[PDB]
Structures are given as C-alpha cells and as structure tokens.
C-alpha cells in the first residue's frame, strides 16, 4: 500500500487543504481507492471542547462525533467518506497510554518517546487502512496531511514516526510532499526566495527526503527562480512545482497537468493505470469552468454574520454558495455584515458602518443569516428578520438564528414582548425557546443533538419537501442543544406560522415555514455539509432561483436536479 | 464626434432678420476646438474671423474673464466704442484674477460637507448656495465636495417604500462634519 | 560606549538599511557621536571583485577603495564619513589569520573558533572606536549591522563574538534590535503570524535576548496582534514597533516617535539628552515632508536601462532624484526602459514592447542613461543618444554612456561609420575610445581610475562650471578605466564638441559639452555619491530645471544652491 505524507512548510492556513487533496481525486477516477487521514498537533480537541463560532466550525459530515474542519477539502472533490478514526490528534494518544499503563501492556516498566511513541502511531495506520469505505476493497494509496508549521515541539513526534515508517515496507512504498511558501512583497520587486529554503532545511534535519516541492506563490515566476531551487534543496529540476494564488479552489487539479508532474508519481511508486484521454478524466474538471466563468447574472447576495470580512469561521459557507451558482450561470458576489453593528448602539457610537451595511443588504434579495456567538449580537439580527417578512425578501436560516426568527414573530405579528429564550434571559415569564436534552441508551445527564439522527416530515405540501422528491424520513446532521416548547406552540397553529419539520418523537421543531411569504424556510440542520459538485444541496437552489425570480418555473419541469 | 455645426447657424440667422448686427461672436462648447471649425463660421454667420471666441465648459465661474484674454478680444471693444482706457499691466488688473485661483488648485484638505435639501442632484433653487460656499472654502484651502440629499427620503414612508436610497443619503451625511440645511417646500 | 546591534530577519532584502540608520540620525543631531560599523557575511568581496551592474553597484562614497551598498542609507540621513574598516568581510579576515600564523602570533599552537575566533572580531571593534570621523573626539553609540537572514552558517560566528561581547562590558553598555517580517498574503486575510514566530526563536538559541522587537508588515495592525507576540517572543509589551510599507525612506523616524520608543533606549543605556522640542529635531524632519507631499508640477523622467523595472542595480539612482525634486516642488515619475529592447532585433521579434519604451521616452524632457554591463545593449543606447541631440532634448551621462555618445557623434555629425572603442570590438581602424590605465607609485600593471581622484577645469563659460560656485579643482570619484585617445580629440575642436572637463596630465577628457544645444552635458563620475537632503547634487538640479525650462532664471539670481 502507498501512502503520500503532507507536511507543513512556512505558513498553516494560505490553504493547504486543496493542495493534498488534489492527488486523490486525480486517482480516484483512474480505479483506485484513496484515504484521508488527518493528523493534528494540537493538545486541546479538534472539535470537541473547541468553540463554536470563533476560530473555527464543528465539522460533522457523515460521523458519529465531530472531527477538524480541514477534513472537507478532502470529501468535496473525491466521493468517499471518513470516520472519526481518521483524525488523530494529541490529545487522544494520551488517553490511551494511561489505559494501557493501568492495565500493564509495557511489561510494568517506563515508557519514553522512542520506540515507545514511534511504534504506536503506524498502528493506527494500519487499522484505518484494513477498515475501508462503506463500497470497496482495499484502498491502494493514502493521503496523510498534518496541521501546522515546521519545526514546533508538536510536530516533532510526528516526523520521527514517519520516518521509521517508510524504513519498514519497501523504498517505492512511501513518497513526500513539501509545501512552501514563497513571500514577495510590494516593495521589493525581486522573487527573494529565502523564507523557503530555511523550510526545506528543517525538514532534511530529521531524516526525510523532499521528494514533491510545492511552493506557493502570487504570480507565475519565470526560469531563473526554479534553477536556484535545484541547487539549494538539492532535488531534481523536474520536482519543483510553481503554484499561485488561483482563482477559486477546482483551478489545482487543472495547474499541476500542464506542469508535467503526474507521471513522475507513476515512475516513482511502480503503479498502473489505466487512462482514456490525458493522466485523469477531462470530462469533468475542465466542462466544470465552463460554466462559471463566461456568462453570468451578477447576483448579488448579502448575508449578516461576525465578522465583517472573510475568516476561519466562515469557510464551509462560501463553498457551498459556489457549487450552487454555476447550475443556473451566477457570479459568486458576498459581502459579510456584522451583526454587532445593527444595534441601537453602533448608531449611537459610530453611525458611519452603520448605515453601510443596511446599504448593501436592502439592494440584495437573499438573505442567509447562520448563527452567532453567546448574546454578543442578537438584537442585530432581529432587525435584519423583520423585514425580510415585510418586503417579501427571502431568508434562510442555518442553525441558531431560527431561535431570534420565532421571538421576532412573536413580537411584531403576535404581541409578547416578554417571551424570551433561556439561553440568553432564563428569568422570563413566556419561556419560548427552552433546553431540551436528550437521554439516549447509556448516556448520562444532558446530552446534545449530534450524530446520526433522521427526521421525519409532517405536512405534505411544502417548498421544501418537493426539492428532495417529495420523500418521508430524511437524515441530517445536527448539533443544536435548545428546542422549542411544545406548550406555546398552540398559539402559532392559527397564524401562518406553520410547522412543517418535527423530529421521531413529534416534540421538537426544526423545519418552519411562513403562510403567504413567497419564499420564507427556516431550518435547523446544516444543509452545506451535504452538498457536492456533483450534487448541490437542494435548500441553497431554492435561494438562488428566488433571488432572480427562477424558482416557479423550476417546479414545474419535474425538478432535474431534486 | 464630428463637431457638426448646424443649431448655430439657426440661432445666428434669426438675429439678423430684424436689423440687428452680430458683434460678439460667443459660442458655448464643450472641449477647445482647432482652427477648421473657427473657418466655418467666418462665412456662416458672415462675420469677421477675429470676432468668434471660442468658449468650453470651465471648471467654475471665475474663469470667464480669464478666457476673453487670451483670445484677443479686449482690444476689440476698444476700437468699436473709441474710448480711453488707463491700464497699468495688461487690460484688466492682474493682481486678483490669477492671485485668486493661486488659492484653490493648489493643495486641498479635502472637506466633506453634506447638506439636506428637496432635490437629489444640483438645480435651479440651489444656485445661491452653491456659489457662497466657493467663496469661503478658498480662504482656509479647502476643496468643493457637497452632496445633495433629499428631504422626502429621510421620514418613515420612504424605508417602508425604498430603502434603498434611505441608507445611502444617511451614509454621506454621517461622516461629515458640517449640515447646513436651507428651507422647503410646504409641509 | 554603547554599542546596537541589529541582526537580520526572515527576508535579507526589505530595507534593513533604513530600519538602523533611524536610530543614528535621531542621537546625532543631540549631540552624540554616531559610527556605523557594517558586517558582510558573504565569502566573496561585497565590491572589489563583485560584477559591475548586475546585482549590485560598486558603492565608493568619501573612500580609498569599495566598500557595500549598505552604507549609504547611514551616511545621507546623517552627516559623518567611513573608510574601509567600518565594512568587515569574511574573506578579509581569513587573509589577516594567515599572516599571523606565518609569522608566529599565537604560540604555534593551532586555532579553532572558539576562542580563538571571536576574541578576533572583538579587536576590530576597537580599532573604529578609537578612530573616529575627522573633526570630532571619542563616539559614544555604535551601530553595528549584519546581511543575509538568520540561521545560516556564514553569520554563526558573528553571533558567538557578539554573545560574549557584552558580557565584558556592564549590562546598560550594548543593547540588540531584531528586526523580522510579517507576511499576510491576499489570499488569508487574516494575520497569520508564523514566520515571525520562528526567526526570534533562532536567535534566543545562541545566547542573546531580543530588545527592540521590529516587524515589518504592510499595513498598521490593530491591537489584538501586539499582545499575541508579546507571550510568544516572552517579551515587554512595548517593545513591540509595528512597521508598515511606507511612501518613501524619510518616514521611519517620523514612526517610531508616534509609537513612543524613543525614551526606551535612555532608560536602557543610562545616558543624558538636552533635547530642544521633542526628543530629536522637529524642525528638519517635519519641514522635509512640507515639501513633497504638497503640490506637485508632475515632471515626466524616462530613462533608458538595463531592466524593465526597479532592482538592486539602481539603487543610488532613484534616491538622488528624490532629494533634488523636493526643492522645486516635483513628483517622483520614473519609468525604466531596456536598452536591449531598442534595437532592429527587438524589432523584428517581439515588437509589443520596442514600441512602448519609445513612447514614454519621447514624452519626457529628460534623459540620464547610467552604464551598461559589457555588449549587451549598447545599439540600443545609440538610437536613444541621436535624438536626443536634435530634438533640444536634455541628456546627461553618468558613466560608461560617455563612450556611447563620442561614437554616435562622429557618425551622424563627422562621418566615420569604422570609429568603435576597443571593449566592443578592438580590431578597428579609428581607435576612438583605448583603455588608458595609470601607473601609481608602488603599484605594478594596469590598475582602474578608483579612489581619491582630483579633477582639473579647463574652459571659462561653462554651464556645469556655474553650479558648483566658479571653482578651479573639484575633487570627485570614479571607476572608469577607459579613455579618450588624444590623437582623434584634435577634429572635434573644429565642431561644438569641447572639452571643458580634463584631469591632472591633461590626458583624459571626462566633462564634454556639446555648442548650441540648450542643455547637452556628459560627464565620466557620478554625482548621486556627493548628494545629500542638506544640500542635492548640481548636476542633478541642471536637469530638472531644464526638464520645466525654469534653468535661465536660476543662473540670474545668483544660485541660492551652489
């Protein structure tokens, strides 16, 4: 079995996810099994303990837990799926050590890092490489990326165990892929490549090999830069590979053919393969661009979140809006407004972001509002809720945000200014949205919502039903705590407040929808993570088509794509 | 493109049919023109060469006399009515034109002044104001930079009706430094 | 006496000359005297047998031989002279270790690199310190500056000789500034401090402890970005300087006094300051930008090199027309023009670009060709030459170019087509331009024209004679090797080439000026090395002037800059 190792380089998170993903779907196509298995540095839990919306997302995409968010570059572009045995962090050893210990496993004596943490990190490599996909064999090559820098005290433990790994089965069984970066600032002009070559010299210092240079840049450099990369990492010519910021994320896969370097994968690790046109499929990748950048709409969609640019928090969102706009020919245009400066503070602080933000989101006819952070925020949101009912916008909420959606209606339409959810004011007297837990077989206290869990529909005819085909249990992911309560439903049975979305027990609501609205669907679940290029989520069609006014006569064809 | 001159001649002939006799020959424009179309109107209009002045769209309204000079035409006036004239420099006095405009296309601060009023753009019932401000942004250095934001736009119907313009007049307005709002129109 | 060190950083070529100059002009104008000492860890000789215009330039500024490039951004910002031992290299240290072995110096025995190595760099420091600049007594704060990165094993050993340095002295007699670089691609965002992480790890790993903490980024951070270094680095919280991409090299000493550093170092070295206003001079610094960034003519300069754009071989050159536009109120527009890309083979290639540099050359009102570097693109600097000349354009020719112009005039004007210096194509029968070495008292062969050289006038009414006041001996350096052959200089006299620029023997023409041309001036030296903001360069301020026609009223009131 093969097995391709990623490791870190200059920087961690210029987007070092595509790039060692980009080799497995280019053999995924030609007939054999690839892997994934994520490794991470860290001591704290991936996603465990980590926070919600802050410096990352709770990545829970087909698994019975949540595992790194850097796990979804490797599942968009191929068509397998992973476990939670993939991701390995530091954390989890150490608990493991302590079990054997009690025990008695080390014969009673005392263990160190050599051969005693070397030895026990290729065993679980071998244990996710005999436990495959659900729809396979046994996979051939594997793609094995870490998290990180160069040279850390946690990264360390992790180099020595691979080196050892390769000594064990054959030379042609084992392969490295070095990524760089290659700075260049505004000032200087001249490529000065010297950030790059202390980063390959790190790596040599350990007893590993380069064998796949990557080096990440801004610009096509020319001829003179590659030729000092050959003499001061002492690698081949052919092995240096010249990578700039691309455009989107599907433009990898497409730059490393014309460079020349897929059959150098071939002659090194003594495979076949059995190719139609040119390496991989070309039927794919390059009808893909073909659809996106020549004809397009200029839509223009503006959502409300944290942060007022692009950041770590937002990245499973900007994915899933590109798969969806080039089925109908749009241009991918978002603008990120902070939901903290849509308060009656901000305008008595600084009115001048103010009023710039309600600029940019009143000329937009879409709005996909996710969740927040604590109580830092809410009231923002109520604002920006109310008059998408009013102005038949059309509005879409993730996860949380259904939670300021159901007291707003409460308020404006109903009349209870008091009602109030417990997260942020338990001390209320119309308590709407309370804390329902979940006692599951084995578990104790309270448990969350997350994992395998299937919903059951309850009305028939919906907007939402008819984009899946009109089905009857459907499974999701989810990872809410907070439910409504069954009490004060009653109220919203004579409105156009209509539940249309009820879980096995017919006692919590995820899926509302709004009589008379054109297009008003509000969900729970997270319909990103179950989206694809090869099928996009059917709930982000539905916002496209209603934003250009496309979405009765999509219905009426039979629904191509449902 | 072509600068086709024919609304000119019809303006220039009417005059004529009724006893009068064109001196002065001003020609309103957009950008300066070269010599070709200056030949066209000597035997158009059937006036003298030297009498058509060539007049663009100036950057403000002080620039006017400024013009007439270099084309030549003071001296004109002067053959046609035979009177006395007592210069010191050339013509006119030169120590407050071009002293005046010393002061404002040189360095400027760049000040943003916002003001509400009862039209989107510039018209006719804000002349006055427009002229004022000119006059007393060139004695701190300072640069025009006025919007105008209207007043229907600023109540509750407008929000519930448009918002799209209602923000944006709110924008320009709050980060400037300065309201100077005139007067309406009725309620 | 105090002594500041600055190491390198992640990139060796951002503009480290600049970061230490600050701190010497700042002490000097308070009445402390300022040396600078600069180190070169390169094997080879920084400019003696360095390539004349390729990747560097031949730095000879007030100096019996060739020192760095380095050196010349602490000489204009201050007002003191260096020699030849401020510039320490490593191949002129392992000439002086062999001499001592010969002889007999260290007991026989043999030497290593510690302490037989750093104790010898330590002498050396001694040897600057007691010999000051002339007219002064006794320095009192060192700067003391290093090239290349850090790790590499070339600036090992200057790292241990500087470790052990301060440990002879007392505590408050040296102090360390580290500079770095904070990379943040267009593509991330967010500041993703990493490779700053990593170069002051380095550096704490030989023995010396960071004071001055100096990033370099593109633009000014918030403050959520000081405090997350300051745990990682284990240092003050002011220490830290955030140090942005600025408009020009005069705006470092107007940051680091907002930041609020400046009454760090007196606490730090326990020493005296009879300031005036604030800290240093606010009456020169602040004066400067008033005249720059105000109102401008916008004054268009083409000229005519070897590459497109900007690089280290033009450093000197775009630093003396900044200091001579700022006195007649002018913008900096330069554009660079390839000479390789005006010939008739450029034209029948690729004539996309012929064209182009044309184009902006025949708008401007200026042309200052340098030199060029061998045969390469000497044709193309004859076509730019000719027209010059004819179409009352102002030329002026710093070196190497004057050979250019002789030949096109005998052409054009005279008539001899076979007339070509000997460097090109020595087999001719019009020897126009020979090499005319010179003989020096002790030296043996041909030695070049370099170092302490005085030049004699030789006609009365001249225009370059005027701007330095109507002297009679000017002295200046140079580099050429190559002469004028005094048998072909007796048909020029006839025409309006004169000769008003001779030297000692009256043997060598170098100040040739050409009769009814408005302003045609060609020199052999270079006036960018006598420049400074205190008072520019005459023949850089006949060009500008010429290029605005504001020249005739300069001579008419006497020159107020001679």
Redesign the interface.
Known sequence: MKYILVTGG??????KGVIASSFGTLLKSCGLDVTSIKIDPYINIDAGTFSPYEHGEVYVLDDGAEVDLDLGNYERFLDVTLHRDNNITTGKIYKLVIEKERTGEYLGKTVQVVPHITDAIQEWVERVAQTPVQGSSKPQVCIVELGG?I?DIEGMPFVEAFRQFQFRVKRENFCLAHVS?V?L??????P?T??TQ?SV?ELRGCGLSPDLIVCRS?KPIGLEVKEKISNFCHVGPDQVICIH?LNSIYHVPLLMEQNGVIEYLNERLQLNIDMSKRTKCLQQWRDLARRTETVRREVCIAVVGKYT????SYASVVKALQHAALAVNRKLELVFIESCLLEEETLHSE??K???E??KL??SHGILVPGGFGSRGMEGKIRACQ?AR??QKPLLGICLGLQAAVIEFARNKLGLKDANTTEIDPNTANALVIDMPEHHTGQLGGTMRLGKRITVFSDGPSVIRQLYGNPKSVQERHRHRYEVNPKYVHLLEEQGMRFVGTDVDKTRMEIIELSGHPYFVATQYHPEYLSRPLKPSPPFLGLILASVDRLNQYIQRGCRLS
Do not use: M
């Open positions: 200059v920087i961690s998170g210029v987007g820098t040279g970066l700075p600032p505004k000032a200087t002009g001249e000065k010297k950030p202390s010299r801004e910021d640019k692009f950041t770590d009115p001048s103010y009023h710039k309600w600029q009143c000329d008059w009013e102005n």
